[PDB]
Amino acid sequence: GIPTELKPGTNQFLTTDDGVSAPILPGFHPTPPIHIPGEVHNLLEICRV
Amino acid sequence: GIPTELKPGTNQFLTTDDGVSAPILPGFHPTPPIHIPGEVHNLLEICRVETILEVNNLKTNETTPMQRLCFPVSVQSKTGELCAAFRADPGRDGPWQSTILGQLCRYYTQWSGSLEVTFMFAGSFMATGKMLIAYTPPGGNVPADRITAMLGTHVIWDFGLQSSVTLVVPWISNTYTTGIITIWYQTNYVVPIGAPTTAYIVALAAAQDNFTMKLCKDT
Amino acid sequence: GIPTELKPGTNQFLTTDDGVSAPILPGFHPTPPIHIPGEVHNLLEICRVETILEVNNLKTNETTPMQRLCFPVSVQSKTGELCAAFRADPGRDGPWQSTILGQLCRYYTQWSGSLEVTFMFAGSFMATGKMLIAYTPPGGNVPADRITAMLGTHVIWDFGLQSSVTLVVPWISNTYTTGIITIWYQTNYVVPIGAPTTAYIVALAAAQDNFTMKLCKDT
Amino acid sequence: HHSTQETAIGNFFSRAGLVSIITMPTDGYVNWDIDLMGYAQLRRKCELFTYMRFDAEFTFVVAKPNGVLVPQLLQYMYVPPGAPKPTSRDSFAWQTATNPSVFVKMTDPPAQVSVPFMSPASAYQWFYDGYPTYGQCPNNMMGTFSIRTVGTEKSPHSITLRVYMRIKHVRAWIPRPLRNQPYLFKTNPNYKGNDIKCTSTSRDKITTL
Amino acid sequence: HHSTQETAIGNFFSRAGLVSIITMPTDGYVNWDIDLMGYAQLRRKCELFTYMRFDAEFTFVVAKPNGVLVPQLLQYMYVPPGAPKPTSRDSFAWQTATNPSVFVKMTDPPAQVSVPFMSPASAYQWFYDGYPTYGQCPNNMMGTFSIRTVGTEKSPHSITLRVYMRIKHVRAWIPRPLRNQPYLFKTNPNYKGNDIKCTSTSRDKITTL
Amino acid sequence: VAQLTIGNSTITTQEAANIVIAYGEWPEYCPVNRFFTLDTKSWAKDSKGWYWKFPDVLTEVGVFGQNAQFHYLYRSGFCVHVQCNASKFHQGALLVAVLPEYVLGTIPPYATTQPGQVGAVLTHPYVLDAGIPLSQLTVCPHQWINLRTNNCATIIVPYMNTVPFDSALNHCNFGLLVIPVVPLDFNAGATSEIPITVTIAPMCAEFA
């Protein structure tokens, strides 16, 4: 095996990390979305009425 | 060494992970496969064969279960009356437990598609008549008379010319929605001398080419 | 550092893994090899040399084991009778324990291929006769008379011209299948004055070019 | 409108489930031989076809009778088809070099062993019509596992473990009607012929929809 | 029809098996020198050839007399061919810088050491016909391992460990008949000449098939 | 109408282009050709069903009874032809379907699992004496004999085994079931028993 190294910061649960996790249902297919009118892309479209 | 980092999620045994593991016999050579006919690539090739429904599932036929596949027409019956009726859900109990479509729909949760129900006459050659195969759309009411069932979707079947007619249910779904099918006596049963008075019909049922299902579940 | 993840299967000592480990002497230079004749690249070059079977493995030859390699023909024997018989499995006990083919087939589990059995006459020069080398196919019965053994697969061997004949067993396998070989007196033993009355035959046995085996196993 | 990947032959047989549960109180060794048809589930599902071909993947979750863990060292020995089984706790077969093993502590993530396709034929078969030589039984025999605690003394810790098993690279042939009767034994397709439970449940009148 | 890779010379010698078992009760040091011909297995298998050339790969599984583990620190010292051995627990040879060592705790995955080809000749040999200068013995001498617990006091923990050994990069020359007689000593090919066990087992009559 | 002549035997069937090829494959080579006609079974009013084991059914008749008992290896296809001869005053329906690796079950001795050329009868045909229900038998290669319209049914079966060569005296590859789904009915005075004739014909046989 390749030599690795463990820096400090291991085994910590940071609540605001964008980390990819293992899915619970690998073979599942979600229902594909359709076109529904009135999509909000940003909250500054609500602050202009 | 390179610097690494251990995220949360370590040392957990998830039961549904496609992870490659270390083999136990590295130098072994398995026996290479040969051509054996009849390979199943998908379970929807088993859900497309005509299997026999169990329409005559009364309380008295539990002792002699060979009679549960055929339901009788007769000569003493009048005209314009009802012969048999059953719902059109492959999931729940009743007649559709006895087919292969209603036994693979116990291994899943949601299904959606179209069906087809095929009938077959098994009477004498010298007899003839007419039958009415009425299909009530889902959410409606069961007809009380033939003249109300004639206005819906129905197929006129005379067994003097053909011996088998196919009725196609347009759409079912599951997330009540029942597709009630009734068999009406159009004309009475006529028969010459020597041929027997009674006959029997058998019913077949399978799925169409747009019947899919998802969310694997254990019974 | 990069984010990593520990799957199950950590800290396990599997005894059959081809894993590279840290050397104990990094600056050492081993002695570079030279050319030595007779390199064995595969164990199937050892299973292709004619070694001596042990056909005469009676109960009385356990004290003087030098007599177990040669079985006698004689002049007092009649015609049309049996000389010797043995099975054709290299795995199990009996004669084939004493060869190098039956000692490398104790280190494995499944084997399949063809063999060859070679005989060799070690009698006087002035004597002659004929012998019948009959091979019963697997699953059949042992012959009781020469005229039934003649109808199968057999080789007529007269030792007045040749001194060695080779018989090829077509196929064996192991996952009863026995390839019973019998030696029949075709003609009696004729001999002039001065030459001795008895003789001896030795048997050799090795594998063909399509004899493979698998699933390494310890004895 | 969706795709047809939830009914592929591979995705019908995923999601490893429990196949055994093994205790070991305070003998000292166990022999669990590999079998699929030991539970009512996965026997009815693998008998939908006739010829299957797959390898496996095992995992040995191990603990005490109530949850807790102790620093104990364990050995799981795999016996290939055609080798003699260990008879005692200190038999010679525990040190035979060709039967592979794994050494795993109890305070470790669980072990994971993958066994390839072991048959001399080209596929497994659950139904054999003929005779071997006495019962109508086939000759697959996937293997045998053996578990013991290392050491020359009786360890003062009763151990329980369970064996999970996945199935990879599935191919099937020749479908078959699904079994609708209860099971009696694990070798033969016997039923209770004194009463036949009907396939469907009953209703009163044929026109009572 | 299959390939011929199950009878290659490399795959005949894989799957590391046990070569020693070492106790250390409550002296305090052990000297196990490296030898192949210590067990009846792998002596009969390596004497099929005459000249072999390989390196090794060791693994030290270590525990208590019954399974359990304790937080103890250990030292495994490797002595090359031609160096003086440690005589006492606190000899100077334990701190010689050129004899390499490993430091491993008991609550750790086991150590793994790889030893290269150490002979001054071009290959090993198990059979020497001539004389060294008194017995007909060769001069390979692969090495010596030495094991102790670090510390200046007697540790109150009796330790047992076993040494597994793989063999990598095997080449062989000049095959030889396989030994069929029992062994008596570990240096010479002696047998018991008062009785010779026959190679095959017997039958009654030559025509009794 | 036509008259097929293969070997020293001949049979008389009409031109019927409704063969069923099992699993969509013809039998072929690269891993004794005549029409053997078995006994005729009498379909009564309350018969239950019959089954024949293959190739056990041909180990007593023909030279194939001697080819199977003398040679070890064996590999072949088949061609089954079943026909029923009834008038236009009888009614009923039959289901004939092959079934690979048909294992029976005890409520068995050697007379029931391998009945030979005569064939045995079923006791509980709702479960096929094997635990599987009758209603899903049509996943196998099947064909309907309905006495109203047609009187013949033919199935072409290719070779189906995991090992390319196999003994003929121990193993039995598939069975062949004939079940009266809708029973026979007539009035009085007509013929009480209807005959059913089975015709076998091997295709691309090999012997080693």
XYZ file of N, CA and C in Angstrom, chain B residues 91-170:
240
model
N -52.532 -6.472 -7.397
C -51.868 -6.460 -6.116
C -52.609 -7.233 -5.052
N -53.855 -6.853 -4.798
C -54.603 -7.381 -3.672
C -55.075 -8.804 -3.947
N -55.822 -9.351 -2.995
C -56.242 -10.741 -3.050
C -57.399 -10.918 -4.030
N -57.923 -12.138 -4.080
C -58.997 -12.465 -4.983
C -58.534 -13.374 -6.099
N -58.960 -13.089 -7.329
C -58.551 -13.941 -8.451
C -57.103 -13.763 -8.854
N -56.548 -12.565 -8.730
C -55.229 -12.285 -9.279
C -54.088 -12.768 -8.395
N -54.368 -13.453 -7.290
C -53.302 -14.082 -6.525
C -52.719 -15.287 -7.237
N -53.478 -15.895 -8.137
C -53.145 -17.183 -8.717
C -52.348 -17.078 -10.003
N -52.063 -15.879 -10.475
C -51.295 -15.702 -11.694
C -49.855 -15.336 -11.361
N -49.011 -15.311 -12.395
C -47.617 -14.922 -12.195
C -47.445 -13.414 -12.188
N -48.440 -12.665 -12.655
C -48.371 -11.215 -12.553
C -48.682 -10.755 -11.141
N -49.615 -11.422 -10.478
C -49.963 -11.103 -9.116
C -49.099 -11.748 -8.069
N -48.076 -12.496 -8.475
C -47.102 -13.024 -7.536
C -45.761 -12.319 -7.619
N -45.485 -11.617 -8.712
C -44.331 -10.737 -8.773
C -44.659 -9.318 -8.355
N -45.934 -8.979 -8.240
C -46.338 -7.690 -7.708
C -46.489 -7.713 -6.200
N -46.197 -8.837 -5.559
C -46.038 -8.867 -4.117
C -44.606 -8.599 -3.694
N -43.677 -8.556 -4.642
C -42.277 -8.284 -4.364
C -41.903 -6.839 -4.633
N -42.880 -5.966 -4.838
C -42.602 -4.580 -5.171
C -43.633 -3.713 -4.462
N -43.587 -2.413 -4.715
C -44.496 -1.493 -4.047
C -45.354 -0.686 -5.005
N -44.776 -0.139 -6.066
C -45.519 0.658 -7.026
C -45.401 0.033 -8.405
N -46.521 -0.033 -9.119
C -46.542 -0.556 -10.475
C -47.518 0.260 -11.302
N -47.272 0.317 -12.607
C -48.120 1.096 -13.494
C -47.973 0.579 -14.913
N -49.098 0.339 -15.569
C -49.074 -0.118 -16.942
C -50.434 -0.639 -17.361
N -50.454 -1.237 -18.545
C -51.661 -1.786 -19.138
C -51.609 -3.307 -19.135
N -52.781 -3.920 -19.121
C -52.903 -5.368 -19.071
C -53.601 -5.867 -20.328
N -53.864 -7.171 -20.355
C -54.743 -7.775 -21.343
C -55.291 -9.063 -20.757
N -56.591 -9.266 -20.905
C -57.264 -10.451 -20.397
C -57.798 -11.220 -21.589
N -57.415 -12.485 -21.695
C -57.803 -13.339 -22.806
C -58.730 -14.425 -22.289
N -59.828 -14.656 -22.995
C -60.763 -15.719 -22.666
C -60.627 -16.845 -23.679
N -61.197 -17.999 -23.343
C -61.090 -19.167 -24.206
C -62.261 -20.096 -23.942
N -63.004 -20.424 -24.991
C -64.168 -21.286 -24.874
C -63.761 -22.743 -25.033
N -64.297 -23.594 -24.168
C -63.962 -25.013 -24.143
C -65.224 -25.854 -24.166
N -66.133 -25.528 -25.082
C -67.360 -26.264 -25.256
C -67.365 -27.083 -26.532
N -68.525 -27.672 -26.811
C -68.677 -28.529 -27.975
C -68.631 -27.714 -29.261
N -68.462 -28.416 -30.377
C -68.317 -27.730 -31.651
C -69.654 -27.301 -32.231
N -70.720 -28.030 -31.930
C -72.014 -27.797 -32.550
C -72.846 -26.734 -31.846
N -72.326 -26.095 -30.807
C -73.080 -25.106 -30.052
C -72.591 -23.699 -30.370
N -73.471 -22.723 -30.154
C -73.149 -21.334 -30.448
C -74.004 -20.409 -29.593
N -73.645 -19.129 -29.619
C -74.305 -18.135 -28.794
C -73.560 -16.817 -28.881
N -73.805 -15.948 -27.903
C -73.144 -14.651 -27.852
C -72.914 -14.260 -26.400
N -71.812 -13.552 -26.153
C -71.500 -13.042 -24.824
C -71.055 -11.592 -24.932
N -71.218 -10.856 -23.837
C -70.869 -9.441 -23.768
C -69.814 -9.245 -22.690
N -68.667 -8.689 -23.072
C -67.555 -8.486 -22.150
C -67.420 -7.004 -21.833
N -68.037 -6.556 -20.745
C -68.105 -5.136 -20.420
C -67.013 -4.764 -19.432
N -66.392 -3.609 -19.648
C -65.322 -3.101 -18.792
C -65.731 -1.739 -18.241
N -65.952 -1.676 -16.938
C -66.264 -0.407 -16.303
C -64.976 0.380 -16.070
N -64.938 1.660 -16.433
C -63.759 2.492 -16.155
C -63.600 2.726 -14.664
N -62.395 3.072 -14.198
C -62.159 3.169 -12.747
C -62.852 4.374 -12.131
N -63.414 4.170 -10.946
C -64.134 5.205 -10.244
C -65.621 5.227 -10.509
N -66.083 4.546 -11.554
C -67.492 4.487 -11.874
C -68.232 3.474 -11.023
N -69.443 3.161 -11.459
C -70.312 2.225 -10.766
C -70.482 0.943 -11.570
N -70.748 -0.144 -10.860
C -71.042 -1.418 -11.524
C -72.395 -1.316 -12.220
N -72.514 -1.747 -13.475
C -73.812 -1.692 -14.148
C -74.796 -2.672 -13.535
N -76.071 -2.306 -13.596
C -77.132 -3.168 -13.100
C -77.867 -3.884 -14.220
N -77.800 -3.364 -15.441
C -78.477 -3.965 -16.575
C -77.526 -3.929 -17.763
N -77.756 -4.837 -18.718
C -76.920 -4.933 -19.908
C -76.989 -3.670 -20.754
N -78.157 -3.025 -20.806
C -78.328 -1.843 -21.639
C -77.594 -0.632 -21.073
N -77.222 -0.654 -19.791
C -76.320 0.365 -19.275
C -74.871 -0.026 -19.493
N -74.573 -1.325 -19.442
C -73.225 -1.808 -19.698
C -72.872 -1.781 -21.171
N -73.869 -1.700 -22.046
C -73.593 -1.634 -23.471
C -73.062 -0.264 -23.866
N -73.412 0.774 -23.109
C -73.020 2.128 -23.476
C -71.552 2.402 -23.198
N -70.926 1.634 -22.312
C -69.525 1.833 -22.005
C -68.598 1.227 -23.036
N -67.506 0.628 -22.582
C -66.563 -0.043 -23.464
C -66.782 -1.542 -23.343
N -67.089 -2.196 -24.458
C -67.407 -3.613 -24.400
C -67.112 -4.266 -25.737
N -66.945 -5.586 -25.693
C -66.641 -6.406 -26.858
C -67.701 -7.489 -26.969
N -68.340 -7.577 -28.129
C -69.318 -8.624 -28.395
C -68.570 -9.858 -28.876
N -68.780 -10.977 -28.194
C -68.058 -12.214 -28.453
C -69.069 -13.310 -28.736
N -69.097 -13.788 -29.973
C -69.845 -14.981 -30.333
C -68.864 -16.132 -30.503
N -69.102 -17.219 -29.793
C -68.183 -18.337 -29.847
C -68.550 -19.343 -30.918
N -69.420 -18.974 -31.858
C -69.637 -19.818 -33.014
C -68.583 -19.670 -34.086
N -67.845 -18.562 -34.077
C -66.816 -18.305 -35.074
C -65.421 -18.331 -34.466
N -65.174 -17.514 -33.453
C -63.908 -17.520 -32.747
C -64.017 -18.379 -31.500
N -62.866 -18.724 -30.940
C -62.811 -19.441 -29.681
C -62.077 -18.664 -28.605
N -61.568 -17.480 -28.926
C -60.774 -16.706 -27.991
C -60.818 -15.245 -28.392
N -61.135 -14.382 -27.432
C -61.160 -12.947 -27.657
C -60.329 -12.293 -26.563
N -59.666 -11.195 -26.911
C -58.771 -10.496 -26.000
C -59.333 -9.122 -25.681
N -59.389 -8.799 -24.397
C -59.837 -7.502 -23.917
C -58.653 -6.805 -23.268
N -58.444 -5.537 -23.601
C -57.273 -4.793 -23.155
C -57.711 -3.741 -22.149
N -57.230 -3.866 -20.923
C -57.446 -2.832 -19.911
C -56.500 -1.669 -20.196
N -57.003 -0.436 -20.315
C -56.154 0.670 -20.779
C -55.080 1.118 -19.799
